[PDB]
Design a protein around this nucleic acid. Structure first.
Lengths: 125, 304, 226, 116, 161
RNA sequence: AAACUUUCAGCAACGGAUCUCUUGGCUCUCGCAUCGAUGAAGAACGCAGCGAAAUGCGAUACGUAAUGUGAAUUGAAUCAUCGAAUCUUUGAACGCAGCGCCUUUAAAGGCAUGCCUGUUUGAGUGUCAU
RNA sequence: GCGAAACCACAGCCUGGGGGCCAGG
RNA sequence: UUGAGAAGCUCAGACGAGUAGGCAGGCGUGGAGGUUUGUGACGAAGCCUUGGGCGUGAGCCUGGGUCGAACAGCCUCUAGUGCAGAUCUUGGUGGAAGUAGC
RNA sequence: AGAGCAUAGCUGUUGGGACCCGAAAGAUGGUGAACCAUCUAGUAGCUGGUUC
RNA sequence: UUUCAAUGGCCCGUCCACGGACCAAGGAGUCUAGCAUCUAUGCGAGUGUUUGGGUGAUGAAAACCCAUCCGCGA
RNA sequence: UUGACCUCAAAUCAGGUAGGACUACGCGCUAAGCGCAGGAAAAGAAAAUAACCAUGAUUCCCUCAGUAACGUGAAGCGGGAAAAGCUCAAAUUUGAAAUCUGGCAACAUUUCUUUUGUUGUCCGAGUUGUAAUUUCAAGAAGCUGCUUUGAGUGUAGACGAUCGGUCUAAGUUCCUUGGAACAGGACGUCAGAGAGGGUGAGAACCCCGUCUUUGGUCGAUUGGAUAUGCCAUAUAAAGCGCUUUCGAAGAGUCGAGUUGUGCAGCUCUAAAUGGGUGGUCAUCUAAAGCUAAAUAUUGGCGAGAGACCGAUAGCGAACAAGUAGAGUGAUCGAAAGAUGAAAAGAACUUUGAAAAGAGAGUUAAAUAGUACGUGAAAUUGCUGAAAGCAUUGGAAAUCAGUCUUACCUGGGUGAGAUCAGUAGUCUCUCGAGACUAUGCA
């Protein structure tokens, strides 16, 4: 139960805030769990996704698939992964997007900012 | 994306009209340059074949090549159905039975099945006898295949057949069951033995079913009656039809000769749900093939 | 209410006698009738058949009224509280509540009333030294001070017989909160527990007593023959 | 026009916080000033004792609090009221005496120039 | 509803959302330090004053107080001198002593003299003595500022220290 | 007999009811106090994304600087913060309604009225002194 | 080829007796 | 003899038009609290149905078809709660009629 | 040798727009050379309607 | 269910007339203050906490508590 | 001839300020019109009540009280919220205009290079009066002896307030259904977090959040205090003792006569123990001024809710909405939400001038194909059958459900348990249940 009258439990406000969230807020909304090994060695439960992250699809029709996140489609809250696509009628391979929570990060693209984020968020590189 | 309904309908209308215009222009210019140069007309017609489910069927290695295979013919010459296909030529003797306490609707279809098969009996199912007990009883009484028409709620929805005495048992779910009255331009069958034709049973499991259906019919049809019973497997749906055929002229036909079909009935469809190795026991049967529903959602994936 | 600027039979018109904010929303009850109902609701909480009749899963509670030590007031973790309810076998009511969480039927879940569930035990404490936070996340459990008993929490729905888990000090202060029928309450001014219309409420004990069955005229038949 | 009281409990809370704010500012000293005891002015209520506005100049002179330092320690001064009877004088002189009995006034920093 | 409010809904610019809604939030005690170090931030000011041993009101209270536990002449009112009162709690005792000690530190209210004042009073003293301030005042040749005998006495008394 | 007419049933239309939803309204409460001659509110005209019958922005034209997150959009950003800049023509609108003027180098800086305070310069058969 | 609108409880054989009721044509 | 929902069960006899008007008991809808260890993607609600059933009735239960995400019984609370009509309001659709007519 | 006071419910009744719709005016402030916006839910013995 | 047969059967509301082409949806004794009776409830020569104050750590617009008045009654 | 002052002018001289908009709440003039403000406004420290044991600025709430008064309709008192008091005019500083704006020059300072001051100097304002002192509650001037004292500027730390960043618990284990597991079951975990939202169906443990947080940490801006340093123009300024001394108090106003709506107009026009207002007494002390809080708030900048509405409802507007559109104009003013989990929005072949059609293909579903959730009725077409309101039955079509397998009795064969002329364990209260052995009379 929330006790703060600063936060709203109104569904209308939560739904408006989610879908009218800006691209900087959507950056945090698209977060994926790390694998067990990364979770137990970086001491971080979950990170926002990024391009060039190595992930495994955990739920859905594409369960078990792996690949690198080619891009993040933040407008539709969707991820795009290498070779996880769908063939169209004409023979084109139109990519299919998956929710960031439905994948798991198995190899992080470690920039310098992530390492600073890791140490800041109770982590040990 | 446009959350105004009218505008998104006008935006689609403009998009649709432009899409139709430039696809027509591309078609028109292609038509002009093809009639001018046939060398690209049939060139396109030889690669741009429309795709269909059968052409896009998922790969299964169990599909047998048209060329004869020794290993398959080694396994098929001494199996349960061998006494029908060997030099013995054992005449099939069918037993037809309904589920316990069936209605007149079940018998109005069982009679049509009886018409489809000469020398096939029908013992009304009575008392506390079971399918594993009829099989033993019919085995000692000279029968070689027992069909059980299952109905509930005044509709025949299933058909299990067991190959006597211990041959494979198949479980089908009938559908679209039409009687001869319900068929337009029907006919009255005669006593002539029908001729069976079977199509499109490519997979090896298909041959197990095809031999099971072949073993029901007498191996020597009476051609003078020109009655033909068709078992066709399309996208795993088995269609059972009976027809009267008479050859005549046909300008559309390749050799100028074509046959006219008059439907005899009954008309129905089956789906193969279970195949068991032995007498049909629902609880303790050795499952040869179980039809997983979640795997049949692929419209391009067939087991028959 | 609706807007004051917003015939009633004409579409896009105005409704008949539009709603006003100055409707009577609250209602007064004599403070003695409020206190009588709190006393009646507490007395019912000590009848195990009224607790079962209200839906509580108290079939393995050691004793009703269920009163626990004052160590419970100093609980810190929900694990300690969930453990306590399991030894006193009050947790089956918590399983009843946790399993009963549904989505609401109606438009009421478009109005922030999304979920519904049953009501678990009412823990009544005397001092808050950690008990409230250790118990407040177990679904259906409500904690309340013994100085501020709420009729809304003592007869949910107007239905009598809530399952109350008292602490020793809460139970000790019940006589100061409510008083006697002859002696006054210490924590209410000049307040005495209501008196009853009958003395022994078992009327079948009165009717079938030797006092009354010794002077009655001999009874005719039950359902009589035709 | 109807005056509706839906903010009756929101007013109650706001006034408590204003009291809480007032204390936070001057917390060692009372949130209210002291008042005299006066007798209501009619034949119906003259037997009651109620709070007045401030103490008279005769009352402060008799107690020992000059009218200038009276306000600085939270003693209101009503110049309008007077003492027509000795009962009101001695009732409120004693009231100031009791208030001064419990008063702890904290010393202030006083300018002390180096020269004479 | 209003056009100014639709102006904001139909624009992607965020609102000036300020999150300062803290209910059950009591004001924190600046002002004193001894009171701040003995203030229970949960309890009411009445409870906090009462626990600290202070009076929140020197007047009556216009409502019932919280009861938690079942607890079991003109010349006489004018010349009486009440000898303070005991300090019930240790916080009030701490306030009392620090105020007395702070008075001791800032206890030199008495003023020294200056060069002008010292020569002024001394010159008057040498001619008139150290006891006849009335005749000192009536002199005008030496008492140019025309101080009265009461201001001359303070100068004389102040010169010694 | 058939058409036609009616009734019933099936299917196909037509229509958009119902049901379910809902970034909307309505109502109550709480907190706060901030427009303009240093050019407001409003109006027009542009710019690029585009669907504009929407939005943002102003010739630095979805904005530039600085800060932050840190790597997009479909040192990135149709991001957030935001103290520095810039902000077309109007409009209380202010040189007169193109026409003019003053100063400086076509460009730039200016040119409304009332009143307040002061500064400077003028006038008085206004008074007075020499 | 284009193409309404007003209007519409329901419908349309006569005679007599009390435009459908009664008895006849 | 088990037949105390004592608000239950049981015996008997008489009676039955009904406008205004009075009294009582019930059926239904939106939301509220409690409750049914309630129902639900193995299909909620809605809708369709010469399928069946219950009640004098208001109405309720159900089979089948359609459908695709929520719903209901019981005890209280509450109300913007029940339509055949107001030359009612809004929308939709008819016969007139392929007529008048251009 | 006092029976009242409070709360709630039903019923009646009185005033508020007062069961719903329907009436010829006029006033204040504007627009164009009558019109427009409020007042206005103007005035009801009356008409039509008023749901298991 | 459809139809046939024999029998009966004159269009509904409203006050002759007035409304009715059909269908769906919406559509009218409401809320509030005063008074009177009746019933229930609590207390009872009393009675009424909710102007306000206290208090409420789980939601705090609630619930709980109550000083001084004041009403009506006597 | 000169100068001083006065009055009136001029300047694109320097420095300012006013307008217009909003207007829920405020205050005025006359719902509307007109004028003017603020974060509140207005009111406000008695020319106020009362008749008492008297009260004590204002505002607000309750009550008084639907009372008095003349259907209108209060007020004194009483209960409460909040409480805070003051500034001038009228008396010579007269041993000293002690007062102030501005220019210039320095210096300091900042929410700020944007702000705000200090010191010095020069001119101006001002004696037709700027300061100090005084405001009736008094007060001045003496006299007296007790107690008192900063408009200064730094540093330090603490406590507060605001603003931005940062810190945080636990399953995506196994089985079944499904296009998808967020469902069912099994087994676990966290809980100061089981609010809410998202994710391909009901998610505390997938994600954002939530709780901790009534807080640690980190920047930055400031409150009032505290400790301390350096300065301090005190030859000063106060409070209260006393008096052989004084004690100023607001006029075209009050009041009277007469008209219009207390107020205003017009005619007349005062007083000094006076004047006002109440019952000779009491009580105020007008015609000058300021003043927080308690109170109001359909606007502004934001929040958090709800027994509210659920697309003919709810704002006119859930979307393009004051928009499209109408009118010369003032003004008036709509209708319009939903494919799917994902466009995978239908490749390709073919007919047709095209629009589109048919083969096909995607989907779990095309009975989801944008004229897209569900898809009612009125209504229209086609096909099939029959014919040319109620009662009762016939014909035709259709439909409901409908039982056989059990009871008893006898024997044979084995099985065990609640049986044993049997041994143990656990939980309750001797024996009651649950068991594990061993035997089968």
């Amino acid at each position: 139960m929330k006790f703060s009258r600063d936060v709203t439990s109104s569904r209308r406000k939560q739904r408006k805030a989610h879908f009218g969230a800006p691209s900087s807020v959507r950056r945090v909304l698209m977060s994926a769990p790390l694998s067990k090994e990364l979770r137990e060695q970086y001491k971080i439960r979950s990170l926002p996704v990024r391009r060039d992250d190595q992930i495994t699809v955990i739920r859905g029709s594409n369960k078990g698939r792996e690949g690198k996140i080619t891009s993040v489609y933040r407008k539709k809250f969707l991820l795009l992964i290498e070779r996880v696509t769908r063939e169209k009628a004409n023979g084109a391979s139109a990519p299919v997007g998956i929710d960031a929570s439905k994948v798991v990060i198995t190899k992080l693209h470690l920039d310098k900012d992530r390492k600073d984020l890791i140490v800041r968020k109770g982590g040990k590189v | 994306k446009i959350k105004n309904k009218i505008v998104r309908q006008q935006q689609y209308m403009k998009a649709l009209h432009q899409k139709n215009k430039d696809k027509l222009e591309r078609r028109k210019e292609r038509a002009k340059e093809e009639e001018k140069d046939p060398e690209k007309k049939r060139l396109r017609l030889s690669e741009n074949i429309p795709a269909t489910i059968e052409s896009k069927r998922v790969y299964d290695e169990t599909i047998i090549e048209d060329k004869p295979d020794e290993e398959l013919q080694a396994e098929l010459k001494d199996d349960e159905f061998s006494a029908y296909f060997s030099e013995e030529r054992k005449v099939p003797k069918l037993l037809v039975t309904t589920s316990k306490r069936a209605s007149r609707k079940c018998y109005d279809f069982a009679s049509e099945l009886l018409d489809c098969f000469p020398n096939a009996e029908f013992r009304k199912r009575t008392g506390d006898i079971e399918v594993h007990e009829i099989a033993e009883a019919a085995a000692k009484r000279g029968y070689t295949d027992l069909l059980v028409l299952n109905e509930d709620r005044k509709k025949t929805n299933a058909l299990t057949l067991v190959h006597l005495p211990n041959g494979p048992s198949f479980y089908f779910t009938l559908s679209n069951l039409q009687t001869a009255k319900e068929i337009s331009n029907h006919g009255r069958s005669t006593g002539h033995i029908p001729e069976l034709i079977i199509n499109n049973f490519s997979t090896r499991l298909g041959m197990t079913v095809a031999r099971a259906f072949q073993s029901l019919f007498i191996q020597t049809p009476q051609i003078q009656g020109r009655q033909v019973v068709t078992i066709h497997c399309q996208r795993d749906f088995l269609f059972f039809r009976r027809h009267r055929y008479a050859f005549r002229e046909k300008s559309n036909m390749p050799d100028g000769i074509g046959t006219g079909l008059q439907e005899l009935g009954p008309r129905f469809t089956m789906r193969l749900r279970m195949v068991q190795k032995g007498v049909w026991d629902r609880k303790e049967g050795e499952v040869f093939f179980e039809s997983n529903a979640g795997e049949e959602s692929d419209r391009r994936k067939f087991w028959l | 209410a609706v807007s004051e600027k917003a015939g009633n039979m004409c579409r896009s018109g105005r409704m008949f006698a539009p709603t006003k904010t100055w409707r009577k929303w609250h209602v007064k009850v004599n403070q003695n009738e409020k206190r009588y109902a709190i006393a009646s609701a507490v007395a019912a909480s000590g009848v195990p058949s009224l607790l079962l009749a209200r839906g509580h899963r108290i079939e393995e509670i050691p004793e009703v009224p269920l009163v626990v030590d004052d160590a419970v007031q100093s609980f810190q973790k929900t694990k300690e509280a969930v453990a306590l309810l399991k030894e006193i076998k009050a947790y089956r009511d918590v399983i009843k509540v946790a399993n009963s969480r549904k989505l609401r039927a109606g438009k009421g879940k478009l109005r922030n009333r999304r979920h519904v569930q049953r009501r678990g035990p009412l823990v009544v404490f005397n001092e808050d030294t950690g008990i409230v936070k250790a118990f407040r996340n177990i679904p259906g459990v409500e904690i309340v001070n013994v100085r501020r008993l709420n009729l809304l929490q003592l007869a949910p729905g107007g239905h009598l017989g809530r399952f109350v888990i008292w602490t020793k000090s809460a139970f000790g202060l019940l006589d100061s909160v409510f008083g006697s029928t002859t002696e006054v309450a210490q924590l209410k001014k000049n307040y005495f527990l209501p008196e009853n219309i009958i003395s022994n409420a078992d009327v079948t004990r009165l009717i079938n007593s030797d006092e009354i069955q010794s002077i009655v005229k001999a009874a005719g038949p039950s359902r009589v023959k035709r | 026009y109807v005056k509706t009281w839906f903010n009756q409990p929101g007013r109650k809370l706001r006034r408590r916080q204003a009291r809480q704010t007032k204390a936070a500012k001057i917390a060692p000293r009372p949130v209210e000033a002291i008042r005299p005891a006066v007798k209501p002015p009619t034949i119906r209520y003259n037997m009651k004792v109620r709070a007045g506005r401030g103490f008279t100049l005769e009352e402060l002179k008799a107690a020992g609090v000059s009218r200038r330092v009276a306000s600085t320690i939270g003693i209101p001064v009503d110049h309008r009221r007077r003492n027509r009877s000795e009962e009101s004088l001695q009732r409120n002189v004693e009231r100031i005496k009791v208030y001064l009995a419990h008063l702890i006034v904290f010393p202030r920093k006083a300018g002390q120039p180096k020269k004479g | 509803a209003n056009p100014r409010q639709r102006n904001k809904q139909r624009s992607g610019k965020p609102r000036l959302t300020r999150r300062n809604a803290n209910k059950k939030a009591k004001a924190k005690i600046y002002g004193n330090f001894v009171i701040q170090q003995n203030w229970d931030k949960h309890a009411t000011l009445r409870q906090n004053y009462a626990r600290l041993g202070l009076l929140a009101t020197p007047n009556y209270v216009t409502g019932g107080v919280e009861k938690l536990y079942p607890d079991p002449t003109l010349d006489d009112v004018l010349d009486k001198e009440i000898s303070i009162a005991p300090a019930k709690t240790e916080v009030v005792r701490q306030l009392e002593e620090e105020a007395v000690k702070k008075a001791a530190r800032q206890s030199n209210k008495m003023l020294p003299l200056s060069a002008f004042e010292h020569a002024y009073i001394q010159r008057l003293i040498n001619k008139y003595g150290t006891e006849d301030f009335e005749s000192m005042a009536k002199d005008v040749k030496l008492n140019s500022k025309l101080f009265n005998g009461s201001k001359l006495k303070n100068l004389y008394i102040r010169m010694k220290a």
